[PDB]
């Protein structure tokens, strides 16, 4: 598996990944639905550093998934992490490798201090995946985000740069 | 079940323009009048990411164009919107209306998280009034000489449905 | 009493009229709180025809109140009416005269077809005032607007140009 | 049979050809032009201007019959001036009456205008009585109103009201 | 005695006051307005627009007598519409004839226009015969032309040509 | 009762700038850093009607400047905001805090109609934690090494209060 | 022969007509030499009324020449006339017909009052051509224009609208 | 000798505007019409450094305003210009004209280094023709119905003077 | 006693006067200038530019003591160059040590920078050992680095890290 | 006689760029440096109608590219210009130089009507000095350490030729 | 054999590929980027910016050998930083010496710069002595200068003057 | 005597210095005559480095003269020098000191390589002044500049940085 910076040609893949996520899609904190809306927003934020995205491909260049770093704050050296694996490739064992490649980039190239992510409390499976990748819960946000017209509680988990880089030393 | 709602794209504008044929009323795009296709496309480029209105192309499994679902006057302060549905003449008497109305309500109340959807129906179209009544809408107003149609003012019923009613159904 | 078009020098009066209305103030559908915000919005919409405002003064040029015409639609020739009387001059008997002067302008100078207004159902006193000025209820809007964090029902009342101008003939 | 379709960019060639032998300056939203490239740039400039509205007249086989123009569209006084141009080939086919009525229908039922007026040269009484038969009535005889072939001409202003055209 | 002076920014207050009790919407270069601040910004916007030209009428002691307006100035057909407004105080002093002639002189000798027309309400025959005595002649009786107090009104269009006003 | 909240004006910027004295942290205006007064005023002119943040000057009956109530990260999608309160040093130990916190909550929940207010407090300031707890806030997170203070990362408590709790009180 | 308004496709012909005229070419009073300069100037003045040009073609659409009206003054209703016939078609007898077609347009469509032209004194042949087309000398301009580094005298000839239109009446 | 030419400044525009009184001809500033002082000042700000025209205020030793020397149609390609001189009515019959004409010629031929100055004089003003003839000018044209004056076309003499003649004098 | 205050527009006169006799071109955000009007327009241009940060040094009685400059602020490598200018009147009052420490404190606790460096002329060993006593250490001897009085000069680059200045 | 001068077009820029090969000096376009072809084309689009410089492509009858004639520092105040000529290496010793120099002088003195052409030649290239001397140029200056060439200052001769000399030849 | 050619738009793909496995953020005129589309827009933005100059290194058969970069070009102090990147395929072919000399030749004879410096990681002594053999000399040992793989590194700054490279 | 960079307040002095120089004044190669033209040009080129000017004042702040550096070329490190001493202070002995102060700035602060100046051949006095300040003639430019409508020859004199700085060593 390979992480490649997002290109214009990858926007179709991005649009298709939102097929039945049953939630409003956002591009640099701006909502969109159509492909033409997405392409206009991509042209607008092509140099915006607030968010960073990587397309995950395999040896045969099949589009496996998407790695996103959003809310990139260079003051506090923080960023939020989101990973989306295409439905067809969700049951193969790629999540852990992609989470670690994303953490390596965040902590070695972006030189960030802290990476955090949000997981729905009703999704306990994801909590253990991220716990097994080194993340630890730092918050249980009450009625944080709306899903299907009802407020949900969300867990916030984190991992620090010093731990990730010096874990085996 | 076979019907699908898809966000409007540029290639769908020809369908929009054709839907205006023999409707005997000036067409508007984000409250701006237009008649020609080139006027429509220019207004589409201008409001590509204006969120005051949202439109969805309704297709069947064979990708035949069935109709259009419009959400206009989207007010994010009061969390309300006006709903219009236009079924192509060749598909107008096949019973698609009720399904599309519920799809529109689902998106309005679960993705846009709106509080109230309202719609206006000509008083001289009592069957449309009863169709929306059977889909959950209730009359909240009988607006006198509200709108001009073919050079003469006409009364219209304003009917509403609240998010609380649709979600607890 | 005299109706005078609003001027920049009247913005202080506008700002003071919102002292304890316990609701967000809007200028051409844009929210504001501070005076500097209001003055910037006034410079922005100085030629916008969507709204029209008149300052009510007495013989000694005391600022009595404000007459507002908003949602001015020149397609349907409609407009919404709002009248605000300063607290000190609320118990003197000016409301009726100002409502009629406003209707005269709306129907003779703007040549509008219909004037409507919204009254809180919990404010029955205002309903009878407007009923005594010729307005008639055309709707009981359910949970229309938010006040103090709770949705309210609002009555919509109307008066037509033909009735007002030909009432005594 | 005849159809009225809003003017598109692809119809500008037809507009240009209709001006070939009119012996008077052509105007697009009150701006003079002659070449096709001038017209096209004026079209791009006024694509959203609502002061004028034009319709291409076609038949069942999509032949270009003529053009219906509504100019001087004043939305405060709710008035507009009406002009009709039928291509030389189809001028003697008796299409004018239908196109005048379709133009009035749009003016009074879609644009909801109050008054439609038109100007006819004093020297063409045939057109005068055609418009009279469609409902128009003379309200003025404008003296030396417009210039034609280097000489001022008088024109008849004829009008028809929405109240007359629309019968409940 | 009477003087015609081009309108300046300092005269906008006079313009605003002249609109106090006319019971009709005021327009500046065909844009509606009511407040003084709206007028002033419209003045700054059209300061170089030549579609209209206005003159303040003053007396020897610099009192503001009235206003001469030339609107709809069309430089291709060489025509313009004439309006005159005399302040209520000086309306019965017999100034109108001189101001109409001074306005025509400017129109025909400075702007070199070919035709000046004006519109007079059917219900004021006094003004009709004043303009007739200054040389104007009726060329139209426009039916339900303009709106006044919520009702459509007919107006007389009156004209005078440069050829008539100018005698070598 | 004597204290009053007033929307921020240009003339209040000197007060804002003086409030930054001896706080040992870079000041931000709509997430843009600044130190000098001229930098502040320029950023104020730029964000005069940016609604991502709202500020209120707290005064007493004698119009003495007591402090500042800030609402930042105002998110109208999730209907949430972050709350900061800065009391001038000369008024910091007089018991004004609880009153101002409730005033801020009232405006947040009755005028902005927000769903959730949250705030961040340094873990090494346990008395501030308990003050907000006594005003209705509850801890939803213990964010590890979240913010830089004097060149060293520090943990902060995230505490929240929901609109439903404050309104039904 | 036919007079046709100049189009972009005719610019190559314009450029070729300047091959060996041994004088600086101008487009709306701006000098040019290259084709790319000419095309940029044409895009700049596409709607400028100060100059008007017509391409002269025959029945087989061969490019015969160019008719130019420059210094078009709508205040005095005047314009300067220049005619250029391609070298290959200079000895066939077209000049007179093109001069009269140009005068007809100038006096019937542009409704101009006076047309004038400039002829080099050392070119007496052209003087008699224009004299035979109705032009009369009104001036002998001394050292008016530079040609091959030396000042030349130029004759100015004119024709009025009243004469041309009423000559045969 | 007492008379002085001074480049035009903003404070001299009132003098320019007053000079237009009772001249019975539309005034132009860089070929743009104007009547009011505010129109003049705006056009002055626009052409402050346009070199197509140059104007000089003529004063006496006591700084009384005598007149104006204008150089218009300044053509730097042909090195020519048109000369107009306007003496204030109160100074029009005192013999200043010849001195000012020579001053203007000196500046034109020694500072602007022009090759030819020309001027236009009404044929019905034969005394002005002879004054310029006595100052070195010679007639090169009798332009028929060249200019409109009080609604009627009039003939004008074009007279010239060359740099070689003035310098070798 | 001494105070560091962010630079304001009113302090530009002080900046200009500090350049009077430095015999080298003055720069504002790497743009050269000499006149006060040039400085003021450069100030308006870079008012929000964060590549440089300056502080006016004042005493208790609000006398202008000097200026602390942080230039070449690189937020990716978290580095910046430090310059200090004390007015000739107060140069021998022993203020430099306190101002260097206050500048480092801001650099390492407010801007959270990792490394602060400075350049000192080889020919001034007094300043070299002052900075050494404040914690700086030489990391380079740049050969013919900068131009002074028409001749290239060598400079010592001295640095201090955040890890050293900050002791938990 | 076979050689021809043609105004520079966009398609000739590749020739210009190739002419810069192995000249060991930074290239300039209207006094702006450039190395790459894309830099050249962008600067060409920017100065398409800048008249401070004029360039001509020299071709033979078979349309083979022979060289380039440049006129730079064109000063229309003093009516002067600097002349550079670059012959392609493959054509540099065939005797074309003298013909091209005269062609350039002809255009400079008969079409641009300039008064003086000057050129600079390296003192260490005495044969070029004598070639221009045989074409009419005369030395007016020996400029000491005027220009940098390969990192070292070099003296250059400035030689001139006046319009009066070339025309009376 | 080897050629240095100014960078063109068509060479941006080569630039992007050269960054594939460098494990550090890539910069174009001090702006970070990763994707090709980001690079291309940064190229269009800085096409005329003279703060940096790059040359593509090709062989006789037009194979892409490497890249010569001159960054931090300061035209007042007449200095610039030199970087060279040879594609992995051609790294062991002994091309570096020739490319360093061709880059210096351009820097000192075309740009007429006074000083060229470069930064080399402390941990690569081979490159240090390569540059020493081409004329460079160490002027600094910058402590914790740059970040690599999440850890600060020391770098050697090496310089060469125009006076040394150019011998009359 | 003191050299001070030019400020806006010095423009009056600049304008007065051109009173009777009988030559067109230029500001960054743009001609001007009036003060308002000069002030507009100063605002335009306030940051332009192509020219540099210094006002010469005495101890009592009397305006003595002006030092100008024009044609400042940073490629070749050259600049042209012009010095203007007010008429009242021309016979006191200031020229030499100002020329040397100007050379010191040019060679120590601007670090230029060469300074040159132009002197009219008919002004031999100035030639010896500059020769006594170290300048040497490098050219006798033939008919270089126009004065009073006739071309003049001009001497170009120069001084190099190495000579000036190392003259006494």
Numbering used by the authors:
A (entry chain B), C (entry chain B), G (entry chain B), L (entry chain B): 5 to 173
B (entry chain A), F (entry chain A), H (entry chain A), J (entry chain A): 3 to 171
D (entry chain C), E (entry chain C), I (entry chain C), K (entry chain C): 4 to 171
Paper quotes:
Spermidine/spermine N-acetyltransferases (SSATs) are catabolic enzymes that acetylate polyamines and are critical for maintaining intracellular polyamine homeostasis.
The first construct (R3C1) removes the residues that form a portion of β7 and a portion of the beta-turn of the β6-β7 region of the protein and replaces them with the corresponding residues from hSSAT1 in its linear sequence. Since the N152 residue of VcSpeG is replaced with a positively charged lysine from hSSAT1 and it normally forms an H-bond with R25 of Region 1, it is possible this substitution would repel the interaction between these two regions. Despite crystallizing in a range of crystallography space groups, six structures adopted the apo-conformation of VcSpeG. The replacement of the beta-turn (four amino acids; FFIN (F149-N152)) of Region 3 of the VcSpeG protein (R3C1) caused the activity to decrease 26-fold compared to WT. When we examined the residues of this construct compared to the WT protein more closely, the homology models showed substitutions of F149 to arginine and F150 to leucine affect their interactions with Region 1. For example, the models showed R149 formed an H-bond with the adjacent E148 residue, which disrupted the π-π interactions originally held by F32 and F149. Additionally, when F150 was replaced by leucine in the model, the T-shaped π-π interaction originally formed between F150 and Y155 in the WT structure was disrupted. Substitution of N152 to lysine also removed the H-bond typically seen between R25 and N152 in the WT structure. However, when we examined the chimera with a four-residue substitution (R3C1), including both of the F149 and N152 residues exchanged with positively charged residues, we saw a much more substantial decrease in activity.
